Design a protein around this ligand. Structure first.
Ligand SMILES: *[C@@H]1O[C@H](CO)[C@@H](O[C@@H]2O[C@H](CO)[C@@H](O[C@@H]3O[C@H](CO)[C@@H](O)[C@H](O)[C@@H]3O)[C@H](O)[C@H]2NC(C)=O)[C@H](O)[C@H]1NC(C)=O
Ligand SMILES: *[C@@H]1O[C@H](CO)[C@@H](O)[C@H](O)[C@H]1NC(C)=O
Lengths: 98, 94, 43
């Protein structure tokens, strides 16, 4: 079945996957493209000199190890598999509580 | 395919590593070379007699159990490797 | 042994289950039926 095929593909992808190493660990840098879809800017406080903003922060890179050529559909996995992939260590320098 | 050789290097580093023992437990006193980079001196709360400060707290010791020999000189690893090795338990006295 | 047969059922139920794929991943569209019961409309 198609479901078993996708499960086999995903299990093959995550097998032998080292999360400690970024894509191209011994080669050129990886390019991480950013998008932001600002939902709202809640409060602009003059007494704390801060401002709260809610955003849809999206990043897009290219990992060659997560490449499959069996199924032709763009897989959408549960949000818990992100604890088993490599994701860039992005941080906001001037944030206080997020 | 540097991924496989670097995975082998990492697994050799953590193979036989005890993160409950400081580096040089028997014949040495560990020397932690610290450093601070204050990115922003926060607002001094006069009511609470406190103050906030946002820092880049840097530490650096010498661990002889993490010597390797590969193509790269410095392994810029992920922040999740830092929990499998020994790291000093610096706490702020105040 | 009723707990034993129910444990066997629950173990057979998650045997080979992948919780990363929605039901009918490439063969259908999932249909989530929703409902809300407001216990208190806050301030
Ligand atoms: C700070 O952020 C990190 C990374 O975003 C969080 O690490 C994640 O923590 C969760 C919960 O501890 C981990 O999930 C656990 O996975 C194990 C399997 O190893 C499973 O047995 C547990 O039941 C649980 O599901 C998750 O793997 C981990 N992610 C990474 C990349 O390490 C951390 O929890 C955050 N801390 C706080 C205080 O927000
Ligand atoms: C996957 O996404 C790309 C870019 O959004 C799109 O061009 C392509 O058609 C998608 N694949 C499928 C099967 O829809």
């Amino acid at each position: 079945s198609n479901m078993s095929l996708v499960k086999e593909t995903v299990d093959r992808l995550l097998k032998g996957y080292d999360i400690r190493l970024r894509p191209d660990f011994g080669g050129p840098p990886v390019a991480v493209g950013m998008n932001i879809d600002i939902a709202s800017i809640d409060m602009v406080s003059e007494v704390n000199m801060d401002y709260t903003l809610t955003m849809y922060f999206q990043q897009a890179w290219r990992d060659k190890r997560l490449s499959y050529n069996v199924i032709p559909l763009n897989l959408t996995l549960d949000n818990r598999v992100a604890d088993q992939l490599w994701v860039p260590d992005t941080y906001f320098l001037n944030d206080k509580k997020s | 395919d540097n991924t496989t050789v670097f995975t082998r290097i990492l697994d050799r580093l953590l193979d036989g590593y005890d993160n409950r023992l400081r580096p040089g437990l028997g014949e040495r006193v560990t020397e932690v070379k610290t450093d601070i980079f204050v990115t922003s001196f926060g607002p001094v709360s006069d009511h609470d007699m406190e103050y906030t400060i946002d820092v880049f707290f840097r530490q650096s010791w010498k661990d002889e159990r993490l010597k390797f020999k590969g193509p790269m000189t410095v392994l810029r690893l992920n922040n999740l490797m830092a929990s499998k090795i020994w790291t000093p338990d610096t706490f702020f006295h105040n």
